[PDB]
């Protein structure tokens, strides 16, 4: 019915008016490319050949467009159509008369997409504003869109079968809009959290930690090669840190050349000892933490997720705030290129040698588990004798579960800490966790020491069978193994009952993901519809479509969210 | 023992039998995270391999068969009953977990191009097209014949030379996209000759005809099935996954010279990023690499039953130490470009990698001024119909946030469904307009002078007309 057509989603009101299928759009699998800049995207030749951007013939560009017309559709840098002044369209594929090929001012030649054509790149779902950013086009000879790895974080895209949409603006006006509002370098900093959206990620973060250690010393030729991939190099080789006996540069010395201009920043490495700041060696840090950059030179410190990642006060954030967006784009790209070419010399890996720990550490983990199981048994015996006293506001069952969970959690965390102590400097799990590229202390703990308690619906594994979790366990067993505690690590291997309980926990995780996607989508759409028309007028009042004043000044101070920074008032706290 | 239960009434035959058919192919399942086993169960259904030994006789749409399937070097005992050895899906690949050039970052994979040239992960894609000569029409007969442009009033400019006399292309003839696989003609009633009814190849198939069959179907009409074969050399978009839930595309392909090489001369067939392992906690992958190295050297297929208690990492490591390699499986690698030893020692070992059905050639689409829909006069939908990608409501909200009003306007009006209407000034309702006659008149007012041209999306015109059919009047007034 008419109401049926209009009412539902994919109806005329929403599926055909608010959103609709569009021309000059393309889609294909995305694959990484460290060599492309932040703003560049790699387009396949067939996608570039099908998509055409019409160019008006001017006296300046008549020769170039004439050559493109002569090439035709077959040769790649060609023109698919000619649009005359009358509006007549001459498709060049079917034979055009040599008279038709002649061009005069006012004709519009539809050239194939070429290098440097601004396009809009999208990945569904388009949760935030950074999910549609304008990319310059670089044509490369394979059939996948290729984007730089730093740009993956705004799109929330990884290269495991993902896909993205490519929209080509078809007019100079809309092309200028994209160029000056939505280009990737312009949207490095999000107004949502006044933090940079994009940060160094994956191999480059892990390798920047290793590159910036005090230990790293580079010989002459390696410095040559690293400087070769630095796009903004002045051409002057820095004086080596160690002139004699053999000239040897340092990793920080080369990274100082990457740092843009003169940027001043102080951040702390992840492994910074808390006591260091109060005690001596505060400035001469024993562990080479406390990153300090003075006059755009890395005086000291080990770079990590905190310094080069997506957080407030990061080196990239200070670069965007101080130097500008263009120099910051160059900063991202140069970090990636130089550090990735050093990683060929150094290299990274993950092996079983990382998961395995010392025998003493294994014995300590086992002893912690033994005494934890004994403590849970003691709590159970207290409960059976009714000696246990109920916690205020909780039933005896709830307080028994609370105490048992506390004992098991303390044992779990202690075993994890022992495992983390066992890790050597060379351990690669520790490299990735310390750098912040991937993983967490929890994952190391589960890999090496103890997987931990499996909880479903906020409780230990429930009694699916009559008063027992699995048919193998005895009825009314509240002990650690029965209710789901997985003593073995992933490396050691889960016993079969623990395997099933672990599967139950993982299933809860999967279900939560699936549910959250839909519910959050609905919430986001409703918010946008409620506040879509609100904008800052030229009075700088924030008004809706009805012209009702939502706010007299935006944010009550009339400032945008990206420019602001965290600061301390310093008059508030001190005593009189 | 210390008394736990003395009244056992039954015993399990083997705990690994709790797993199903797809989860039984996972080696060392108990050493993986649970979501990763769940993901491998889904990925193993999409892997490529010889689906059935009678595949030559069968004419199925979308059949993929790998060139050189291999049975796993590290296999579960329960795989024997699944017949995975008989019909394997995947190839054991020398895999190095290393960061080489940054093209393996995220989940992507660097593949050896020389190995790809030698037959590594090469597959065939068979697509079958069916057509039925229907004489059921009263005066319509869909005869099989080669259409002729002069004889048939309805025809298309795609290549018709391939078709033989019967209207069916002979086996062994290359077919490029937009070529006529089958030529069919419907005789046209002469109300007062021919509307073309040929079937055309899916774009970019680029295959060679394998088998052409002519039979009579259930209805008794002549039935023709044509199978087109296309070889599929792996590319830099194809999706490859291991048995431990690690899926990823091929970032780039380096030749044997460029790939890092051990001292023995072994270069990894596949390089996977070390960053995939820790967050996902798929240690089963690492243990499979170690057991695969030991198995390849020893010559016995390794046992990876889930719950064994006789196979530990330490035992595998000692076994490998006997064969002259580092006990944890690391190997000293040399950089292919410069020859210098890589300072870190890279973990290299054979691992069963699979090739999933998702390939970039099937998933690449580009649209520019294509056909439009009848009802909305908007671009079609789907790769088959050259459909444009949808600019959803979330996308338009992002563009509003940008403040790119003109790009939003182009994308939502000018690129999709531009249209012009004539609207009376006195009454907002649209008015009849004869451009060729140059007379524009509005019914209901008897007014000709006051008419204005309005540019609106065709979908909006349809919306206003559907409102009018419901007796609502959307009077759009320019004033």
């Amino acid at each position: 019915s008419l109401k049926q057509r209009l009412k539902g989603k994919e109806g005329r009101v929403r599926g055909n008016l608010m959103g609709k299928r569009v021309d000059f759009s393309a889609r294909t699998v995305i694959t990484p490319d460290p060599n492309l800049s932040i703003d560049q995207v790699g387009v396949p030749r067939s996608i570039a050949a099908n998509m055409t951007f019409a160019e008006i013939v001017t006296p300046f560009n008549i020769d170039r467009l004439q050559e493109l017309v002569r090439r035709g559709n077959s040769q790649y840098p060609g023109a698919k159509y000619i649009i005359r002044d009358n509006g007549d369209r001459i498709d060049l594929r079917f034979h055009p008369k040599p008279s038709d090929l002649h061009l005069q001012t006012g004709y519009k030649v539809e050239r194939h997409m070429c290098d440097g054509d601004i396009v809009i790149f999208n990945r569904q779902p388009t949760l935030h504003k950074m999910s549609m950013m304008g990319h310059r086009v670089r044509i490369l000879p394979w059939s996948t869109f290729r984007l730089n790895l730093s740009v993956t974080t705004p799109y929330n895209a990884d290269f495991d079968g993902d896909e993205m949409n490519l929209h080509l603006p078809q007019s100079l006006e809309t092309r200028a809009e994209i160029q000056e509002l939505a280009m990737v370098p312009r949207m490095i900093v999000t107004p949502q959290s006044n933090r940079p959206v994009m940060g160094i990620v994956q191999d480059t973060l892990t390798a920047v930690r290793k590159f910036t250690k005090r230990d790293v010393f580079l010989e002459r030729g390696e410095v040559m090669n690293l400087l070769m991939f630095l796009s903004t190099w002045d051409g002057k080789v820095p004086q080596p840190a160690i002139l004699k006996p053999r000239p040897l540069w340092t990793g920080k010395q080369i990274f100082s050349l990457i740092i843009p201009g003169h940027i001043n920043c102080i951040r702390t490495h992840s492994t910074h000892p808390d006591d260091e700041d109060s005690g001596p060696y505060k400035h001469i840090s024993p562990g080479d933490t406390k990153v300090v950059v003075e006059n755009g030179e890395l005086i000291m410190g080990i770079l990590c997720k905190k310094s080069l990642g997506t957080s407030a006060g990061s080196l990239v954030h200070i670069s965007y705030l101080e130097m500008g967006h263009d120099i910051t784009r160059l900063f991202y790209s140069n970090i990636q290129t130089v550090i990735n070419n050093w990683l060929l010399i150094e290299g990274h890996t993950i092996g079983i040698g990382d998961s395995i720990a010392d025998s003493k550490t294994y014995q300590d983990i086992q002893n912690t588990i033994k005494k934890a199981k004994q403590d849970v048994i003691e709590v159970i015996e207290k409960a059976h004798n009714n000696e246990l006293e109920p916690t205020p506001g909780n039933t005896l069952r709830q307080t028994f579960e609370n105490q048992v969970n506390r004992i098991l959690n303390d044992a779990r965390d202690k075993t994890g800490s022992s495992a983390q102590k066992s890790l050597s400097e060379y351990n690669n799990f520790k490299s990735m966790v310390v750098s912040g590229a991937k993983g967490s202390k929890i994952n190391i703990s589960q890999v090496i020491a103890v997987v931990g308690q499996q909880n479903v619906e906020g409780k230990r594994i429930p009694f699916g069978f009559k008063h027992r979790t699995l048919p193998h366990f005895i009825k009314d067993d509240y002990g650690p193994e029965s209710r789901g505690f997985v003593e073995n690590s992933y490396l050691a291997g889960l016993t079969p009952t623990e395997f099933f309980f672990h599967a139950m926990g993982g299933r809860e995780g999967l279900i939560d993901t699936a549910v959250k996607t839909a519910e959050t989508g609905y919430i986001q759409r409703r918010l946008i519809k409620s506040m879509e028309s609100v904008m800052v007028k030229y009075d700088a009042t924030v008004r809706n479509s009805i012209n009702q004043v939502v706010q007299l000044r935006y944010g009550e101070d009339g400032l945008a969210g990206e420019s602001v920074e965290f600061q301390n008032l310093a008059t508030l706290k001190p005593s009189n | 023992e210390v008394a736990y239960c003395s009244t056992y009434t039954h015993c399990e035959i083997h705990p690994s039998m709790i797993l199903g058919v797809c989860a039984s192919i996972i080696p060392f399942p108990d050493h993986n995270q649970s979501p990763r086993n769940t993901y491998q169960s889904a990925m193993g259904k999409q892997a490529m391999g010889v689906y059935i030994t009678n595949f030559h006789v069968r004419m199925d749409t979308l059949a993929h068969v790998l060139y050189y399937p291999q049975k796993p070097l590290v296999t579960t005992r329960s795989m024997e009953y699944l017949r995975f050895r008989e019909l394997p899906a995947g190839i054991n690949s020398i895999v190095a977990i290393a960061s080489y050039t940054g093209y393996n970052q995220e989940d992507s994979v660097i593949m050896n191009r020389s190995a790809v040239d030698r037959g590594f992960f090469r597959s065939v894609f068979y697509r079958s097209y069916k057509e039925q000569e229907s004489k059921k029409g009263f005066d319509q007969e869909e005869v099989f014949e080669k259409p002729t442009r002069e004889t048939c009033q309805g025809m298309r400019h795609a290549i018709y030379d391939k078709l033989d006399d019967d209207g069916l292309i002979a086996p062994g003839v290359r077919v490029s996209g937009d070529d006529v696989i089958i030529g069919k003609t419907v005789t046209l009633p002469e109300n007062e000759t021919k509307r073309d009814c040929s079937t055309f190849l899916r774009t970019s198939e680029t295959g060679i005809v394998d088998q052409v069959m002519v039979t009579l179907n259930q209805e008794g009409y002549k039935f023709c099935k044509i199978r087109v074969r296309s070889v599929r050399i792996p590319q830099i978009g194809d999706k490859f996954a291991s048995r431990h839930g690690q899926k990823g595309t091929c970032g780039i392909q380096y030749r044997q010279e460029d790939m890092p090489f051990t001292c023995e001369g072994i270069t990894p067939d596949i390089i996977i990023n070390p960053h995939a392992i820790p967050s996902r906690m798929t240690i089963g992958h690492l243990i499979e690499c170690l057991q695969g190295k030991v198995s390849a050297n020893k010559g016995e297929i390794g046992d990876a039953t889930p719950f064994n208690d006789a196979v530990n990492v330490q035992k595998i490591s000692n076994l490998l130490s006997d064969y002259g390699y580092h006990l944890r499986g690391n190997e000293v690698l040399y950089n292919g470009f410069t020859g210098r030893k890589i300072t870190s020692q890279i973990f290299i070992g054979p691992t069963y990698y699979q090739r999933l059905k998702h390939m970039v050639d099937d998933k690449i689409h580009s649209r520019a001024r294509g056909p439009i829909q009848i009802l909305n006069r908007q671009p079609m939908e789907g790769r088959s119909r050259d459909g444009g990608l949808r600019f959803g409501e979330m996308e338009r909200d992002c563009q509003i946030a940008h403040g790119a009003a003109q790009f939003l306007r182009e994308r939502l009006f000018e690129a999709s469904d531009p249209y012009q209407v004539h609207v009376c000034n006195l009454c907002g309702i649209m008015a009849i307009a004869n451009t060729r006659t140059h007379t524009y008149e509005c019914r209901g007012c008897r007014n000709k002078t006051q008419i204005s041209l309005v540019r609106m999306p065709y979908a909006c015109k349809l919306l206003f007309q559907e409102l009018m059919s419901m007796s609502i009047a959307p009077r759009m007034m320019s004033v």
Partner: peptide
């Protein structure tokens, strides 16, 4: 899969 306070 860790604990009651963590993740499943």
């Amino acid at each position: 899969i860790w604990g009651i306070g963590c993740n499943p």
